[PDB]
Enzyme design. Structure first.
Site, mmCIF file in Angstrom:
data_model
loop_
_atom_site.group_PDB
_atom_site.id
_atom_site.type_symbol
_atom_site.label_atom_id
_atom_site.label_comp_id
_atom_site.label_asym_id
_atom_site.label_seq_id
_atom_site.Cartn_x
_atom_site.Cartn_y
_atom_site.Cartn_z
ATOM 1 N N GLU A 58 0.831 -1.208 0.000
ATOM 2 C CA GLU A 58 0.000 0.000 0.000
ATOM 3 C C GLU A 58 0.862 1.253 0.000
ATOM 4 O OE1 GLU A 58 -3.154 -2.254 -0.543
ATOM 5 O OE2 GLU A 58 -3.276 -0.063 -0.509
ATOM 6 N N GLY A 90 3.282 -12.054 1.756
ATOM 7 C CA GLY A 90 2.507 -12.981 0.936
ATOM 8 C C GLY A 90 1.021 -12.678 0.952
ATOM 9 N N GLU A 112 0.994 -19.107 0.412
ATOM 10 C CA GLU A 112 -0.175 -19.963 0.249
ATOM 11 C C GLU A 112 -0.166 -20.665 -1.118
ATOM 12 O OE1 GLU A 112 -3.974 -18.138 1.331
ATOM 13 O OE2 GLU A 112 -2.927 -16.597 2.483
ATOM 14 N N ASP A 124 -11.673 -21.159 7.416
ATOM 15 C CA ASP A 124 -12.044 -21.363 6.008
ATOM 16 C C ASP A 124 -12.151 -22.867 5.706
ATOM 17 O OD1 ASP A 124 -11.786 -18.481 5.715
ATOM 18 O OD2 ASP A 124 -9.646 -18.782 5.340
#
Ligand SMILES: Cc1[nH]c2ccccc2c1CN1CCN(c2ccccn2)CC1
EC number: 3.2.1.14
Length: 377
Positions: free
Chosen positions: A49, A76, A119, A192
């Protein structure tokens, strides 16, 4: 016990009461704060950002209000993918370039360590050799961290990792005993575990299995996953249990079928604050409940759910966080990590359970209510 809380650098973009900045963090709430996410360019760690440097300053400045607080930077994430990780570990030269850049970056911006959020090694595009190469990267980083600490005479930078909860992903991704030797903490992504992609209702982070969980579906719970990590080489005291301050929602195929395993037609509506398809922040779920949704309790799995019309949400609340914390203690794990600090009811205005009700529940249960919170000398 550790209480480790992730902060997200895109929470700043949420409208009104949803906007969350580093200075909205209670410095006394968590033992560890992790900043998500950092990126990579030419095998060197970078910001993502535009205002990350300013945010790093405010984030790490929270340590001026709590002398015990430690901070880490997470590299990541899901949108990052595996491509830059694969390229970086592929050669020893690229790894050295990366490690060098990480030491410089963390020291410059005053972080106490790095959290790997790849991931995942060995999946999502990452080739089979990345399983072992991730172990190599971690060992090399750890040993580089040890060496640097002595040369500059300051506390050693920490190296931690957020790791998969899916059994297939674990098996193809991690050399557990070897990796566990060099990591300071193992942040297990025990959530999740169900979602609309499955075509039926299911819980985000159930503690135990539901009776209908047959075959491989019996692995989709917090208890099985944590014990899988432990039984396959990770020391309990390094293992950190993942706690979600958000839920997954669904569109019910039949509004009169509202239990676990009910048919769904897709992801539920994005929330008005997080604006995430199929995902509601805890404070967004509180609005749902206030607006007339029926409360459910998934007893076998020790987690709540809620439904109204064709919308169904599986989540975690004060009760479920408390139950899981008691389980965690009985199993003698290293502590809890939370995704994310900015998804808890930080204002206290949505749930009327006090500020940061979910994380506060963990703080109390893990014996951290009386934790020292004083500015450093
Ligand atoms: C993909 C996505 N977007 C979201 C937006 C708001 C809230 C939750 C989510 C999630 C679901 N997981 C959350 C936790 N996470 C990670 C990632 C790295 C470390 C820990 N944990 C994986 C994705």
């Amino acid at each position: 016990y550790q209480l480790t809380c992730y902060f997200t650098n895109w929470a700043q973009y949420r409208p009104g009461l949803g906007r969350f900045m580093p200075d909205d963090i209670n410095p006394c709430l968590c033992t560890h704060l992790i900043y998500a996410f950092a990126g990579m360019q030419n095998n060197e760690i970078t910001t993502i950002e535009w205002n990350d440097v300013t945010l790093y300053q405010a984030f790490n400045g929270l340590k001026n209000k709590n002398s015990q607080l430690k901070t880490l930077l997470a590299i990541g994430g899901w949108n990052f993918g595996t491509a830059p990780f694969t390229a970086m570990v592929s050669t020893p030269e690229n790894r050295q370039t990366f490690i060098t850049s990480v030491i410089k970056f963390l020291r410059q911006y005053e972080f106490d360590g790095l959290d790997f959020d790849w991931e995942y090694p060995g999946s999502r595009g990452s080739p089979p050799q990345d399983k072992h190469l991730f172990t190599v990267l971690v060992q090399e980083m750890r040993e580089a961290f040890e060496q640097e600490a002595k040369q500059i005479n300051k506390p050693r930078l920490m190296v931690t990792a957020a790791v998969a909860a899916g059994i297939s992903n674990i098996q193809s991704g991690y050399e557990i005993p070897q990796l566990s030797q060099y990591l300071d903490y193992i942040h297990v992504m025990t959530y999740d575990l169900h979602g609309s992609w499955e075509g039926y209702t299911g819980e985000n982070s159930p503690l135990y299995k539901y009776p209908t969980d047959t075959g491989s579906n019996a692995y989709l719970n917090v208890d099985y996953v944590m014990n899988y990590w432990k039984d396959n080489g990770a020391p309990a005291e390094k293992l950190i249990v993942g706690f979600p301050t958000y839920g997954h929602n669904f569109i019910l195929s039949n509004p009169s079928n509202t239990g676990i395993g009910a048919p769904t037609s897709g992801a539920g509506p994005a929330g008005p604050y997080a604006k995430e398809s199929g995902i509601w922040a805890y404070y967004e779920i509180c609005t749902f409940l206030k607006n007339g949704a029926t409360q459910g309790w998934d007893a076998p799995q020790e987690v709540p759910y809620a439904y109204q019309g064709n919308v169904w949400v599986g989540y975690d609340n004060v009760k479920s966080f408390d139950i899981k914390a008691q389980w965690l203690k009985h199993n003698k794990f290293g502590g809890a990590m939370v995704w994310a600090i900015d998804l808890d009811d930080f204002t206290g205005t949505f749930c009327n359970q006090g500020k940061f009700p979910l994380i506060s529940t963990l703080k109390k249960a893990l014996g951290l209510q009386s934790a020292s919170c004083t500015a450093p000398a």
